[PDB]
Design an enzyme around this catalytic site. Sequence first.
Site, PDB file in Angstrom:
ATOM      1  N   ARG B  78      32.861  49.725  41.960  1.00  0.00           N
ATOM      2  CA  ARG B  78      34.157  49.255  41.490  1.00  0.00           C
ATOM      3  C   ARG B  78      34.220  47.751  41.184  1.00  0.00           C
ATOM      4  NH1 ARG B  78      40.152  49.670  44.143  1.00  0.00           N
ATOM      5  NH2 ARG B  78      40.785  47.505  43.680  1.00  0.00           N
ATOM      6  N   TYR B  89      37.494  36.970  39.523  1.00  0.00           N
ATOM      7  CA  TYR B  89      38.281  36.301  40.557  1.00  0.00           C
ATOM      8  C   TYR B  89      38.332  34.808  40.240  1.00  0.00           C
ATOM      9  CZ  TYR B  89      38.665  40.308  43.720  1.00  0.00           C
ATOM     10  OH  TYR B  89      38.972  41.519  44.291  1.00  0.00           O
TER      11      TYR B  89
END
EC number: 3.6.1.1
Lengths: 282, 282
Positions: B78, B89
């Site tokens: 994932r 991120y």
Amino acid sequence: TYTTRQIGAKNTLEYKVYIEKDGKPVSAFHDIPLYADKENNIFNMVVEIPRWTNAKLEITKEETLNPIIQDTKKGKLRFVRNCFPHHGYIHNYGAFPQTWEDPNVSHPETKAVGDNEPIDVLEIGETIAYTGQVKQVKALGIMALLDEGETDWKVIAIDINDPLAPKLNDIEDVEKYFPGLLRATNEWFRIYKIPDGKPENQFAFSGEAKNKKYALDIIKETHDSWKQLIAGKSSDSKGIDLTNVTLPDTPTYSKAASDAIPPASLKADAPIDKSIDKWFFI
Amino acid sequence: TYTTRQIGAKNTLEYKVYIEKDGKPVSAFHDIPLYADKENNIFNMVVEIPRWTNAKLEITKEETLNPIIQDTKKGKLRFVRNCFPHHGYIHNYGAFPQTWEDPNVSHPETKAVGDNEPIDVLEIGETIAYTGQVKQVKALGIMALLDEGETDWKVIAIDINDPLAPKLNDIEDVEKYFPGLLRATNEWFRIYKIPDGKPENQFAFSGEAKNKKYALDIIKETHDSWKQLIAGKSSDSKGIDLTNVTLPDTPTYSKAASDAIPPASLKADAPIDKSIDKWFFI
Ligand SMILES: [Mn+2]
Ligand SMILES: [Mn+2]
Ligand SMILES: [Mn+2]
Ligand SMILES: [Mn+2]
Ligand SMILES: [Mn+2]
Ligand SMILES: [Mn+2]
Ligand SMILES: [Mn+2]
Ligand SMILES: [Mn+2]
């Protein structure tokens, strides 16, 4: 068929990437056709820098067959700094071959001389490109960047193989499918060299992104400039290596220049100094 | 001294990262002291995900010694998608060991149960961190994010080794030196799962980032929760592996767990599907 030949390890001064045509190295500057499909406005783009990377790689102008190498400043490898909220380049960055931003004449629309290199291309597709890659793109618009006081047009393009290509045909489509991108693009080229100590750049037309037709007009103009250059008719080619292996009617044609290229010596990427991680808030 | 023992290649289902103390594996969840320096409130942060990466890696609650492992999604690894103008991120992402967002009870300030895992930490320093890294940081503030309806606080922290560490002491300094970051952070956690078909998230206090004092209180609360959990006095530990090797007074204490871990078997990072390249505009 276009492939790449890599010498040395990436992120080093010895690193080189030549573009091959059927296994034969050709000039990435002069030998690759500008048009993939002229009447359909499909171009051949040479990718130099993949999206989200920092190493300032580019088709070098003073080396035979114009391999892509890393730019340098004061003898040191050049890496474009991270400027919030951006991470390296925000587009697949490259150029259109057989084009030249003429430094010998002051361009009217920008009132500044050209930056002495092929016209620049910003490829907005979803997939991240690779250095040396020759992909087919369609132009959707253009922005008049004045980089350190020099005409530095940036073409807004999209890989024809992109899932979103059939839905993009003119500049307004870009804001439709990629909201915020054109504004971010403006900001990026305005502030990317501030962490270098350089002043903020400026755009003509208030940074307005001109449409596809306008884009084609500029692209074709820089093509004619290159036609003059390659023909050996410029008033000052600035020491640019005009060696080519596919244009037999030009004075600097030399089939032999290809075999003189050493064989591939591809090495693993060399490490990049940790300082390039830094996100600048400027 | 803390180091990492890597199993397999990054970006694979077999990938695992254990944290070692003086060469021996310890629980990344319970054996790492929460405080590096309690008198000065310097915390130990366990980095899970390096800034600008997509792999959803995290301290595994159900595996002995809690090695960091990548979450799966329908049999496949994932990854969090790229949401314009962000790349993966935007912070060095991790958690504080010896803390737990209690799922068995509702948190007053947010009126929701905790998300059943260590309190989260966003390290805003310049250097990109690595998975399994234990770094000492200062708490600057905290944000009350409700992730899919659950209490999911986010501590804003900075590596004490960052050049800007001295100048950052409270929440207001984040906007002073990292202008835009807090607003970008709010937006990020609000939309990052939208490309996955999830509803947009929400924040308590209108997304306001509370100050250091406030943050210290919340962290202390979550630490008290872990003490109840590690002591086996929670009404429901949700099948979390409480095996530790440094807390002799806990019912799940077992030094041999350390020796059960296979030796490092580091392999080069595996390629990531090109589709994670995609930039979503939401
Ligand atoms: Mn330059
Ligand atoms: Mn260029
Ligand atoms: Mn330029
Ligand atoms: Mn240029
Ligand atoms: Mn989680
Ligand atoms: Mn977490
Ligand atoms: Mn969450
Ligand atoms: Mn969480």
